[PDB]
Symmetry: C3
């Protein structure tokens, strides 16, 4: 709510290193758009979105507002490019979940060593707990094939794979589990390919968002690292 | 062969991390198959094989069975995709090698930290030796070019280079040298490229084996890391 | 300089790791060359240039002559493959800078822990400063869109960004800032997109320079790390 609050969330408790990379990420994004003012949409979709995931990596709650903008726009822009896997995913799943996420995260916040901001309390699945979730996804793959037969189905397999994985990832994330980042690393190497092949069928893609997914991949390694530090801050000792 | 053994070898002394990844790798391989049951053959070549390399990372000697399955199936699958460089690599090189490797590793297994299972004893090349190993690889390339002049060759360079690099890594790996992992990281980047071209000449590549190799690269870093730990543990 | 001094410069104060990845970076380049004596030009461009950037990484000064050879041959070669953003960047901007650079670094050398070689004294920007430098990059982009407008521009958006970013990185290098390597990590990822599209239009690319930029990416990460050590040694 508070501007004083907004000041904390946005500027509070970044390391130098986190600051450098975020600023450079917005820079490359600014510089790509000061070349292509025409696709202003996808460039907004990157800037809000780079901020979304960098904030998740930090465990900041105000990621969700950014996410809400970002996934919506992206949903449109991924349609205008005939990436149908990404379009139904962002619109139907990510857009409601932004609020759902804000709900359940909101309940589980905490200070962090500078106390200049609030970080979510991160949890760690066990191997057993994990082996279930992996199976869950393979089960619900057959369920994502049954569904979506309706209206026929026009999902190439790979456009398809990146979609199960993305839902499972999103689900661990709202649930505050560190293992989400292992999944995010796979959804990011996959979506980069999606926008890279899209540049051949038909011979086209959008640079702000293909570039966005490269910055996503980097950050998703940061996320895994930082979320580990986070899981310890709230554990056995 | 002991059953109690295969229990240790297969499930013993994994970190939460290694576990969390090796499972997520197999899951993604599975989700891929629940989409295209059509070529299980490749999906199996991927599943057996992720395990191969994940097990070499660990210094686990049972890596060799998984490899034997993996490389043979792989040799076939790359043959159906006109990657004739790779199919001959697996067939003439890797398939006999699982055996030679198993031979030499077995004499140099050690306990490892939890005593829950055993690891190969890793060694480190020196800068001198490594320079020599690398020098060999260029000298040895003119030999791989003279050979294969015979029986003809549309040896595209990319396919060709990765075949030389792969042979040298394999030799170091059987010989239990850490530095294989450096070479592995490069053969993985090269081979990701082979399957990335295979879908322009022409239009069709295998997904499980494209994915397999992305995962191979991830793991080849863990490999490097983990073998440095192995070198410390055993001298 | 002396023959005693050149022994220190080229062989002085390498970690076993840096040494292994260096000799191998050169090995893999040599091999792509034993396959295609066809254009050694790109190969010499690759070899010096790997040496250039590993040398920048180590904070060594004779990176500069290597850079000089590298950026020339390359600037030419990036012309013969019709990559015009890259050719103008290397010739007009880099060849001057190799000189400016040697001038400036020369003032700020220091020894470093083994007392073998001379490392440059690394500094770091603050977040405040970093904010300017990035915002500067944004202004200077529309200002480089003015400049280029005269006599037209066959500048794809991609090529255009990678020239902006590459200059800003090179300004940071000459001024001796650790933060250069974040930029380089982006230009190296961008320049592999460039030589990847160059393959498609028109149906052509050079392996030694596509490899070299993959080896650049690896080394640009090592760069960031070692320059962090390097800032710490010098307050
Ligand atoms: C969208 C806003 C995020 C961009 C990066 C902002 C980084 C602010 O950096 C700030 O610098 C100060 C040190 O001088 C520290 O006290 C703060 O903890 C730190 O957050
Ligand atoms: C081919 C075998 C694939 C499965 C490997 C992951 C299985 C988990 O592995 C095991 O989990 C236990 C958790 O209590 C640990 O105590 C064991 O040391 C560990 O090896
Ligand atoms: C991209 C590949 C990542 C490899 C990083 C693994 C760490 C290997 O680095 C190792 O560090 C040791 C001391 O710590 C040294 O004794 C070894 O010479 C060196 O190879
Ligand atoms: C670019 C010219 C050669 C590449 C670097 C060669 C690496 C040599 O590295 C050297 O190896 C010796 C180990 O015996 C050490 O004594 C030296 O301190 C070390 O710097
Ligand atoms: N790196 C990622 O893909 C990532 C990481 C953390 C959270 N998310 C969420 O997914 C969507 C973007 O892909 C957003 O809704 C994020 O909240 C993505
Ligand atoms: N990551 C790799 O590419 C890798 C790692 C370790 C061993 N290998 C060998 O290649 C075959 C597996 O496909 C086997 O022979 C491995 O010994 C490859
Ligand atoms: N890895 C890089 O991109 C890098 C790092 C440090 C310096 N440089 C300079 O760019 C050119 C190399 O192609 C040379 O001028 C380098 O000095 C590049």
């Amino acid at each position: 709510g508070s501007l004083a609050w907004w000041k904390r969330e946005l500027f509070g408790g970044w390391t130098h290193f986190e600051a450098v990379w975020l600023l450079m990420f917005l820079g490359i994004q600014a510089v790509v758009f000061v070349f292509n003012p025409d696709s202003w949409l996808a460039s907004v979709a990157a800037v809000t979105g780079i901020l979304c995931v960098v904030f998740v990596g930090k465990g900041k709650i105000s990621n969700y507002l950014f996410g809400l903008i970002s996934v919506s726009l992206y949903a449109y822009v991924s349609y205008t490019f005939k990436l149908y896997g990404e379009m139904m995913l962002n619109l139907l799943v990510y857009v409601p979940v932004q609020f759902v996420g804000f709900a359940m995260w909101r309940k589980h916040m905490a200070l962090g060593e500078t106390a200049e901001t609030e970080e979510v309390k991160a949890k760690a699945l066990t191997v057993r707990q994990w082996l279930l979730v992996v199976a869950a996804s393979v089960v619900g793959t057959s369920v994502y094939i049954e569904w979506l037969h309706h209206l026929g189905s026009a999902l190439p397999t790979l456009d398809g794979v990146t979609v199960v994985v993305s839902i499972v990832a999103q689900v661990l994330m709202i649930l505050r589990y560190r293992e989400q980042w292992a999944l995010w690393i796979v959804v990011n190497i996959l979506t980069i390919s999606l926008w890279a092949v899209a540049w051949f069928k038909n011979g086209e893609t959008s640079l702000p968002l293909l570039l966005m997914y490269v910055m996503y991949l980097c950050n998703s390694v940061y996320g895994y690292i930082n979320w580990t530090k986070l899981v310890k801050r709230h554990s056995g000792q």
